[PDB]
Amino acid sequence: QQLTNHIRDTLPGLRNKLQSQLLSIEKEVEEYKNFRPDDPARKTKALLQ
Amino acid sequence: VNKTVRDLMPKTIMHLMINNTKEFIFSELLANLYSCGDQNTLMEESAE
Secondary structure, three states, rough: OOOOHHHHOOOHHHHHHHHHHHHHHHHHHHHOOOOOOOOOHHHHHHHHH | HHHOOOOOOOOHHHHHHHHHHHHHHHHOOOHHHHOOOOOHHHHOOOOO
């Protein structure tokens, strides 16, 4: 309890760093979450880009 | 104060309204259009 109450009002700093990393990954992992070994639509749009 | 407002307003709009739009056209417009269903109907040629 003494240790737990020692990191309060410090967590906001950890939350901002963790949130920042998630923002720079989330825009990309959307393609990975639905990744399929057979996806002609994914392949076609990747080719065009 | 007047100098600052005149200075920051052009700069604000270029950052938020025009440059975000250019980046949209170059980077995403192609993906948004392709992702629409029935690309056959989407790309039907005019009878002419």
